[PDB]
CSV table of C-alpha atoms and ligand atoms in Angstrom, one decimal:
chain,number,residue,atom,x,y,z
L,1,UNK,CA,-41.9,-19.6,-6.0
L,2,UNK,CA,-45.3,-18.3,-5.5
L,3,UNK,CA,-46.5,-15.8,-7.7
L,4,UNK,CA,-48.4,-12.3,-6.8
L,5,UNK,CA,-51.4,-13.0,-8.9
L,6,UNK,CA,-53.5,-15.5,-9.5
L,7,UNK,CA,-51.9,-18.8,-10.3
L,8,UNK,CA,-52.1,-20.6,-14.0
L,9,UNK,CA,-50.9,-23.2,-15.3
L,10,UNK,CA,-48.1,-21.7,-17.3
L,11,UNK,CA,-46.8,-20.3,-13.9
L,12,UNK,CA,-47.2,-23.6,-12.6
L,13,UNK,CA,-45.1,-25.0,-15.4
L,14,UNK,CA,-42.1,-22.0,-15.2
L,15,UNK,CA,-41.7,-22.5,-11.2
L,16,UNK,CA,-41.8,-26.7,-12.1
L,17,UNK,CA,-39.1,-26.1,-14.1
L,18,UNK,CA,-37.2,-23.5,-11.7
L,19,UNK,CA,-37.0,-25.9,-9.2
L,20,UNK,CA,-36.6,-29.2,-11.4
L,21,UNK,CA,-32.9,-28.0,-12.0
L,22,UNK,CA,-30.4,-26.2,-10.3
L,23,UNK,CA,-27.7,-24.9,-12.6
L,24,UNK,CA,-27.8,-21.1,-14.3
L,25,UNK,CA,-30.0,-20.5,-17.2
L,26,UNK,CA,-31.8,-17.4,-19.4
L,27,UNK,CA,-35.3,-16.7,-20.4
L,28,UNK,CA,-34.4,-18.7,-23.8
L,29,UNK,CA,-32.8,-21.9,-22.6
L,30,UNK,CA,-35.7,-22.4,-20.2
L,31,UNK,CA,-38.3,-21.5,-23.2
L,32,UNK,CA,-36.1,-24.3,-25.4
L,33,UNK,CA,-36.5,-26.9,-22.4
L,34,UNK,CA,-40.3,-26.7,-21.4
L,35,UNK,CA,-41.1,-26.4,-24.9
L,36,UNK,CA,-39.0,-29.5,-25.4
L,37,UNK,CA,-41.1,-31.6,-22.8
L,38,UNK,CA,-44.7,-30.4,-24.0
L,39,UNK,CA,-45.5,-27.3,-21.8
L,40,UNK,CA,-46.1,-25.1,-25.1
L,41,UNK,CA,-45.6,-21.8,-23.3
L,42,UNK,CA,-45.0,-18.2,-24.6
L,43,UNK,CA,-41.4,-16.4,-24.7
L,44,UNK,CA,-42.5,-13.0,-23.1
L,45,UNK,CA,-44.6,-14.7,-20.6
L,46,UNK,CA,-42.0,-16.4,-19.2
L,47,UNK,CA,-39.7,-13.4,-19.5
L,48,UNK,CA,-42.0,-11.5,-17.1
L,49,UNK,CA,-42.9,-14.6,-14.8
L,50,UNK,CA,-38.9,-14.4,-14.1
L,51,UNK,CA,-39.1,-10.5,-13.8
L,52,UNK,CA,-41.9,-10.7,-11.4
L,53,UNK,CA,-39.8,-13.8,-9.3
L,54,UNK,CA,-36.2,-12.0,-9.5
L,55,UNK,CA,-39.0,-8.9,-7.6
L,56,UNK,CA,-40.2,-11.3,-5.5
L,57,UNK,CA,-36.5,-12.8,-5.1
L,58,UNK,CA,-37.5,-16.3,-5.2
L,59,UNK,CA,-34.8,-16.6,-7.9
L,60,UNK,CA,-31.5,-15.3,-8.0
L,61,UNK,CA,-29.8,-13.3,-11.1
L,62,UNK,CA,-26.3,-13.4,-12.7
L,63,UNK,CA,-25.1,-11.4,-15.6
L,64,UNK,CA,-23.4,-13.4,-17.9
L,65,UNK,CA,-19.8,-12.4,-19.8
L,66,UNK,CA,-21.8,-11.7,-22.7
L,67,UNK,CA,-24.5,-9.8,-20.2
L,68,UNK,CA,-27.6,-11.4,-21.1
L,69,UNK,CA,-29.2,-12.5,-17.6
L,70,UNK,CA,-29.6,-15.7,-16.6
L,71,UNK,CA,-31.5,-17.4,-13.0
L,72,UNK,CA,-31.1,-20.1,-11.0
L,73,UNK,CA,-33.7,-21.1,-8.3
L,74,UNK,CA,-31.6,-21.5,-5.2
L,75,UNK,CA,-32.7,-23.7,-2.1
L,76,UNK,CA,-31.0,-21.3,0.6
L,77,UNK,CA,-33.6,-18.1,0.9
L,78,UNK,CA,-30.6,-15.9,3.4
L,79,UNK,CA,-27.7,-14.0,1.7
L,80,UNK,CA,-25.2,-15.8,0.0
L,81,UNK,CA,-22.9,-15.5,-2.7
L,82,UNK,CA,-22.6,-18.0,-5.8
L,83,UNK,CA,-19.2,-20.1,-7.2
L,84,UNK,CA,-20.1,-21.1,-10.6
L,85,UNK,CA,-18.7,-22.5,-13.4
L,86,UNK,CA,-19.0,-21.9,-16.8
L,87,UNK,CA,-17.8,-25.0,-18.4
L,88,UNK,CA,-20.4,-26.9,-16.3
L,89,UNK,CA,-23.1,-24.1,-14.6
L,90,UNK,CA,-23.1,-25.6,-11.4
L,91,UNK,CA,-23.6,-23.2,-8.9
L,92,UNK,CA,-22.2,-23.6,-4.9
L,93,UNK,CA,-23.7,-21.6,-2.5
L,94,UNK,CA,-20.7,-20.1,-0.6
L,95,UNK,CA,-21.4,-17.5,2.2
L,96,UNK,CA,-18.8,-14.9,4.1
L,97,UNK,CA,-18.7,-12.5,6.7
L,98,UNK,CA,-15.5,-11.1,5.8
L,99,UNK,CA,-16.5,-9.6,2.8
L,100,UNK,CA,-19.4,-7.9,4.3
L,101,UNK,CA,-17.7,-6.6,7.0
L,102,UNK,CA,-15.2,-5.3,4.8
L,103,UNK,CA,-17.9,-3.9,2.5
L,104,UNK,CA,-19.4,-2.0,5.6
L,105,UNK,CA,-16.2,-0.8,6.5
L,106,UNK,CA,-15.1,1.0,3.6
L,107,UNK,CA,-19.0,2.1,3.2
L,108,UNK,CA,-18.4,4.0,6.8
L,109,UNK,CA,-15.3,5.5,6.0
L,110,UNK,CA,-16.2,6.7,2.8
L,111,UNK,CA,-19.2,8.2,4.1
L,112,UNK,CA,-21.6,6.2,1.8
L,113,UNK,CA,-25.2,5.5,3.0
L,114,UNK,CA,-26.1,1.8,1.3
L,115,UNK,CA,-24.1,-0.7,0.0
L,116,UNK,CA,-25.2,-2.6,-2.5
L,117,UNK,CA,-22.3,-5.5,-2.9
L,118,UNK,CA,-22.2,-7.5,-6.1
L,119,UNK,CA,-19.5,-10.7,-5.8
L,120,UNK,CA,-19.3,-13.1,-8.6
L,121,UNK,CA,-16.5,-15.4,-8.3
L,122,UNK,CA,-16.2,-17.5,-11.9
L,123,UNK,CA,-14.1,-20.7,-12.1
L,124,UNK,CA,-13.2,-24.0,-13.3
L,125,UNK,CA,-13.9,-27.8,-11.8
L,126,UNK,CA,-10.9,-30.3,-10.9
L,127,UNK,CA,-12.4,-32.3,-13.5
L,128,UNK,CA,-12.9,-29.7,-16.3
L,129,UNK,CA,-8.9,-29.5,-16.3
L,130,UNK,CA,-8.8,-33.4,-16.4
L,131,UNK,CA,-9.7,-34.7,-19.6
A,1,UNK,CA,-2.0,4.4,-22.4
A,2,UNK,CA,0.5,2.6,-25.7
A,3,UNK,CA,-1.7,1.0,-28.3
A,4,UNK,CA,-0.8,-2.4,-29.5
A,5,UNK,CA,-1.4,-0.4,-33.2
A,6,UNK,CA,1.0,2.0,-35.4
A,7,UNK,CA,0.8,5.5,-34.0
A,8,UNK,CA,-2.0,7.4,-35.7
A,9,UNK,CA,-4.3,10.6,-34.0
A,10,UNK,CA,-7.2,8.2,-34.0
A,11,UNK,CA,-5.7,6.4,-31.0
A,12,UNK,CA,-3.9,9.2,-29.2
A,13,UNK,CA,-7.1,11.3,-29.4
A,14,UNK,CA,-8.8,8.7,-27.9
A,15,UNK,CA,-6.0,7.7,-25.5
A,16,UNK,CA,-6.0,11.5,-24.4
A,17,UNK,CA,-9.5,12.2,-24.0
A,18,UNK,CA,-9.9,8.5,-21.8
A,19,UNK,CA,-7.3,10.3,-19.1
A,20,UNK,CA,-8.6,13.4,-19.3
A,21,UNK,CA,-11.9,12.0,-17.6
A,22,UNK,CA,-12.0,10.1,-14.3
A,23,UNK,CA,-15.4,8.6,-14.6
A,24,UNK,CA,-17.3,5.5,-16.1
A,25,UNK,CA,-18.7,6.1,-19.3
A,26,UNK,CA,-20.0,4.0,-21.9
A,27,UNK,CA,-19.0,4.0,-25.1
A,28,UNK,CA,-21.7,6.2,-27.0
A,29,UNK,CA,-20.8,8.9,-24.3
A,30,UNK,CA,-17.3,9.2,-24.6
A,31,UNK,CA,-18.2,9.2,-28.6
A,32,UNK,CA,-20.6,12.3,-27.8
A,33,UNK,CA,-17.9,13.9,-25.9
A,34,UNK,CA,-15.0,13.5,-28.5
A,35,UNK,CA,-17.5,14.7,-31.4
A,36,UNK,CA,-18.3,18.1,-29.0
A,37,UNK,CA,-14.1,18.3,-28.6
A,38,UNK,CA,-13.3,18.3,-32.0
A,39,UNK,CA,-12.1,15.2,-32.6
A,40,UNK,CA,-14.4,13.8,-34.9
A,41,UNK,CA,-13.7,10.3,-34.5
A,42,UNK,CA,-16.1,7.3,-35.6
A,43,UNK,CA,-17.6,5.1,-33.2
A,44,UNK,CA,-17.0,2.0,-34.4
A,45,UNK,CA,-13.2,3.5,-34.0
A,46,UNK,CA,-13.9,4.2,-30.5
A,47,UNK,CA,-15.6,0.7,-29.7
A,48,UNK,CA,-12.6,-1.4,-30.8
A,49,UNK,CA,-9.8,1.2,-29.7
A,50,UNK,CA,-11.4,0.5,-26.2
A,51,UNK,CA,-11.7,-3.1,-26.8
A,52,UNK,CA,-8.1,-3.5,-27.9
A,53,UNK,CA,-6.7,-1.2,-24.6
A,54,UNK,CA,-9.1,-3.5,-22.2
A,55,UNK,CA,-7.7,-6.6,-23.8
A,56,UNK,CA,-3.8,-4.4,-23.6
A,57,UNK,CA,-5.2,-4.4,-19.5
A,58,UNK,CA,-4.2,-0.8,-19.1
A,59,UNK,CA,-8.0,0.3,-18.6
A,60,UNK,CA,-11.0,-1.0,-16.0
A,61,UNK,CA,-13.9,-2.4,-17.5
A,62,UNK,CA,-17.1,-2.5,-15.5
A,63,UNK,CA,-21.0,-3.6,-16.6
A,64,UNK,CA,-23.8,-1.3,-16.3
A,65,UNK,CA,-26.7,-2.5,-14.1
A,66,UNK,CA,-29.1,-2.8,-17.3
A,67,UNK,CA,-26.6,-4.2,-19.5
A,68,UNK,CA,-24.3,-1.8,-20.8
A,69,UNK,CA,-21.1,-1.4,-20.4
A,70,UNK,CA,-18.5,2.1,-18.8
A,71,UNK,CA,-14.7,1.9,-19.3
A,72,UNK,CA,-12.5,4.0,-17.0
A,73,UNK,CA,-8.6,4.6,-16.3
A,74,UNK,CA,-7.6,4.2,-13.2
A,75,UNK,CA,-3.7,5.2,-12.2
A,76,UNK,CA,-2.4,2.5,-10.2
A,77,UNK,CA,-1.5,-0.6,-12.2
A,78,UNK,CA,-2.3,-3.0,-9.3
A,79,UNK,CA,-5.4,-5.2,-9.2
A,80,UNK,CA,-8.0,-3.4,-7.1
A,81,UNK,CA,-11.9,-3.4,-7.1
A,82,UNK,CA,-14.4,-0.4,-7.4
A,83,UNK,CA,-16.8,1.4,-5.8
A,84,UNK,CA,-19.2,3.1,-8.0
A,85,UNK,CA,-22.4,5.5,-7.5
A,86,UNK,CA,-24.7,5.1,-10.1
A,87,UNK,CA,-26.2,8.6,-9.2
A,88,UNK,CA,-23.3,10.6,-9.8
A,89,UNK,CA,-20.9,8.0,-11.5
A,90,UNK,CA,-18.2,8.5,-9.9
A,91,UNK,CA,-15.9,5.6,-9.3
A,92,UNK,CA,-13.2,5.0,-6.4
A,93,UNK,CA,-10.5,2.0,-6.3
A,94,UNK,CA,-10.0,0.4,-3.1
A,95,UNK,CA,-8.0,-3.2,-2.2
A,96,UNK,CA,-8.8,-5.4,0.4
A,97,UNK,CA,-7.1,-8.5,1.2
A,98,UNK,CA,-10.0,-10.5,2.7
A,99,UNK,CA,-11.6,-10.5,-0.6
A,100,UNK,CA,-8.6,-12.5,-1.9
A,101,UNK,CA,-7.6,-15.0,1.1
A,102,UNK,CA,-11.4,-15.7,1.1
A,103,UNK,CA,-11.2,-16.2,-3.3
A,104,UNK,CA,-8.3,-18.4,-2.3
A,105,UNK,CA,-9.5,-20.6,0.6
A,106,UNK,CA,-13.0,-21.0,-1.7
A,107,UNK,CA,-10.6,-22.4,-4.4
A,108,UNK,CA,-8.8,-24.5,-2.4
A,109,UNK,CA,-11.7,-26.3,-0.4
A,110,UNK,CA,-13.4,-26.8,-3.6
A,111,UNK,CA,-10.6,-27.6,-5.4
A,112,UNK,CA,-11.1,-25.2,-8.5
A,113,UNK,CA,-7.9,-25.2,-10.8
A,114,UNK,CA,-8.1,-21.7,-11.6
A,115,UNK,CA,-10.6,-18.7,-10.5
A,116,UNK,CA,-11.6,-15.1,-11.7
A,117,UNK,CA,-13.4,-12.5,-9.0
A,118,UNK,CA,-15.7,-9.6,-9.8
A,119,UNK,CA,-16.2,-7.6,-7.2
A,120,UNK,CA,-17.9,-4.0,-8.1
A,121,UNK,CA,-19.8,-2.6,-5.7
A,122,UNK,CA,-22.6,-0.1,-5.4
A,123,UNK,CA,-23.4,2.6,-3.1
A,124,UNK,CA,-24.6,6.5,-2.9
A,125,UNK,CA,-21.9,8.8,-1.7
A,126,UNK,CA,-22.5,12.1,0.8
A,127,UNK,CA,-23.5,14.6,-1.9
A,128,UNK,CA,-26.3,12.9,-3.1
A,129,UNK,CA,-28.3,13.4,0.0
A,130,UNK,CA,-27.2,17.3,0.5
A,131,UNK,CA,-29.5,19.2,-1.2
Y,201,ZN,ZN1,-28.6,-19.6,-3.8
Y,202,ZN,ZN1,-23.0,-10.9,0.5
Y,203,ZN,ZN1,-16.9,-27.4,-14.2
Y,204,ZN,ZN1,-9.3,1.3,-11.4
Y,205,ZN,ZN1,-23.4,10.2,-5.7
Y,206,ZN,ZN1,-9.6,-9.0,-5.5
């Protein structure tokens, strides 16, 4: 995820970590983990290194139950939708054409200009059940 | 809209002034607008009056771009989705089935146990261009 401005190594460090997992996670959890492994690195300066992605759209953004934001660095740049689950926080990317057609549809006949479609679809593994 | 709770006015007032509006509204607003009708109701009242009926499932919740959260009551008892303008705030419900059989044949090829959709959508209506 390159960054607007000039590259440090803070930046450096934040994307590292982006892309060293793949499940959904908030300004706090990713603080907790890089300051865990000896990166040493600021809470609002990652806070707006993750604003200035999610404007860039490297990353992608979900609003928690609670509502507090959390991002996940996705490998597929296209459009596409997320299944996650919250017992575990893996995220699969899943991608229709119905749904978009259907939002488009109901966009013309109601006259709307833009559409702007959010689809979250929360779950549970086969193996969360299992025990 | 029956509260779970004994009859008192504190519910019925709120209960009365919900249906009288048909938009989205967060809770400090429909606090305002009570306090300018006369009611005079507290809003730590309102807050878990409104929690209790979205638990009760007879209103719509939705989450506010930034983070907060509008409540509104919608007739029909079915499940149905919603298209909101955030200019205006107005909010309509629709239903689509491809929204579901595509839910259900994500669940199935993934083999989720149980799933829960959100889908609110987005989108400036007519009016908001006339000038
Ligand atoms: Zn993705
Ligand atoms: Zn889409
Ligand atoms: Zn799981
Ligand atoms: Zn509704
Ligand atoms: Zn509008
Ligand atoms: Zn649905």
């Amino acid at each position: 995820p390159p960054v607007k401005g000039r590259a440090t190594r803070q930046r450096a460090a934040v994307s590292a970590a982006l892309q060293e997992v793949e499940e959904f996670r908030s300004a706090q959890e990713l603080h907790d983990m890089l300051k865990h492994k000896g990166d040493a690195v600021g809470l609002t300066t990652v806070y707006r290194t993750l604003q200035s992605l999610a404007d860039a759209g490297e990353v992608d953004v979900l609003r928690t139950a609670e509502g507090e934001s959390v991002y996940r660095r996705c490998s597929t740049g296209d459009h596409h939708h997320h299944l996650v689950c919250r017992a575990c926080g893996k995220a699969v990317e899943v991608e229709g054409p119905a749904v978009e057609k259907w939002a488009e549809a109901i966009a013309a006949e109601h006259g709307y200009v833009n559409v702007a479609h959010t689809v979250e679809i929360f779950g549970t593994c086969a193996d969360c059940a299992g025990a």
